[PDB]
Scaffold this active site. Structure first.
Site, PDB file in Angstrom:
ATOM      1  N   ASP A  35       0.827  -1.197   0.000  1.00 53.01           N
ATOM      2  CA  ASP A  35       0.000   0.000   0.000  1.00 53.01           C
ATOM      3  C   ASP A  35       0.857   1.241   0.000  1.00 53.01           C
ATOM      4  OD1 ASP A  35      -1.924   1.872   0.301  1.00 53.01           O
ATOM      5  OD2 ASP A  35      -2.435   1.344   2.366  1.00 53.01           O
ATOM      6  N   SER A 199      -0.637  15.646 -11.954  1.00 49.79           N
ATOM      7  CA  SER A 199      -0.881  15.292 -13.351  1.00 49.79           C
ATOM      8  C   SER A 199      -1.104  16.564 -14.160  1.00 49.79           C
ATOM      9  CB  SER A 199      -2.084  14.355 -13.430  1.00 49.79           C
ATOM     10  OG  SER A 199      -2.485  14.108 -14.736  1.00 49.79           O
TER      11      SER A 199
END
Length: 330
Positions: A35, A199
């Site tokens: 994770d 992004s």
């Protein structure tokens, strides 16, 4: 040193991925969920409340010659899905894919929430976010990666998740055979303890690319792609009959649909998520409504590039002094 381990979907949807991990001496192999959005290595154990264990493999520290109680240390964690676990702490030898760390904090669960009990395939979590998020008190502990880092050939790990197939986690090297083209690296902020990046924009299907900054985290422990409501609405507007369902818990769409791809930007590079990756199947057995793999991050407080996004790429988690992320197509 290096390590290399195969990671395997837990079911036919790719809901999560499990990776075998050796703990203790002799080795006890547990299948953990790696994770990159958390920083605790915790396991089902001989200490876990018996009614909260249903099929998991447990770690038994009393059978490990190298296990030591970390006296006084406790831990307690809550995840973004409302699940939780807590317990006490041992140190022990932990190996992943041939890479060994001695003295790793192994957080032994005394209690786990119902979602963990009900998932017999996941024996615990191995956190790979920054050690600043580790919940052990009163002495915060390091992640497996942070403990391994100095010994690695290069201070990196890579995630190469499969679509309905196994993939690989590598530690200490970048497998130049595992991706196509070049890797595009992008800046990371560690301010919230995550692999947080920005992004450069998105496209839906064959549509124009929209240049827009989208902060979010690279999170292998989250199944889906969670993005701002504007972006998500623009995606699902291209699918006949798709809608957001408050009863179901997000966007649904007719199982008869063909889904468009979704592209996200990494600098000047582009990662394309095939439409198939965005199908999470019937909302209940036999239903003709299907659950979407792209969902709004509204009310979560962060955008999350979970497995739907990451599995479309070869992802480098660069833990050098200045961390960065890299993405390549594959």
């Amino acid at each position: 040193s290096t390590g290399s381990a195969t990671t395997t979907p837990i079911d036919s949807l790719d809901d999560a991925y499990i990776t075998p991990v050796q703990i203790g001496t002799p080795a006890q192999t547990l299948n953990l969920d790696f994770d990159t959005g958390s920083s605790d290595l915790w396991v089902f154990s001989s200490e876990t409340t018996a009614s909260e264990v249903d099929g998991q493999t447990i770690y038994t520290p009393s059978k490990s010659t190298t296990a030591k109680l970390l006296s006084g240390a406790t831990w307690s964690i809550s995840y973004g899905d409302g699940s939780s676990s807590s317990g006490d702490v041992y140190t022990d030898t932990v190996s992943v894919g041939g890479l060994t760390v001695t003295g790793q904090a192994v957080e032994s669960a005394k209690k786990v929430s119902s979602s963990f009990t009900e998932d017999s395939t996941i024996d615990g979590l191995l956190g790979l976010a920054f050690s600043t998020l580790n919940t052990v008190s009163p002495t915060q502990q390091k992640t497996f990666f942070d403990n391994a880092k100095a010994s690695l050939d290069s201070p990196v790990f890579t995630a190469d998740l499969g679509y309905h197939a196994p993939g690989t986690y590598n530690f200490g090297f970048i497998d130049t055979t595992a991706y196509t083209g070049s890797i595009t690296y992008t800046a990371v902020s560690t301010k919230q303890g995550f692999w947080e990046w920005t992004s450069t924009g998105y496209a839906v299907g064959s549509g124009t690319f929209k240049s827009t900054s989208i902060d979010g985290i690279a999170d292998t422990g989250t199944t889906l792609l969670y993005l701002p409501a504007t972006v998500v609405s623009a995606y699902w507007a291209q699918v006949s009959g798709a809608k957001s369902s408050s009863s179901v818990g997000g966007y649904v769409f007719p199982c008869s649909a063909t889904l468009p791809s979704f592209t996200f930007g990494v600098g000047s590079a582009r990662i394309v998520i095939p439409g198939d990756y965005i199908d999470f199947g019937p909302i209940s057995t036999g239903s003709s409504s299907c659950f979407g793999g792209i969902q709004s991050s509204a009310g979560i407080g962060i955008n999350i590039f979970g497995d739907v996004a990451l599995k479309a790429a070869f992802v480098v988690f660069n833990g050098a002094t200045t961390p960065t992320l890299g993405f390549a197509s594959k």
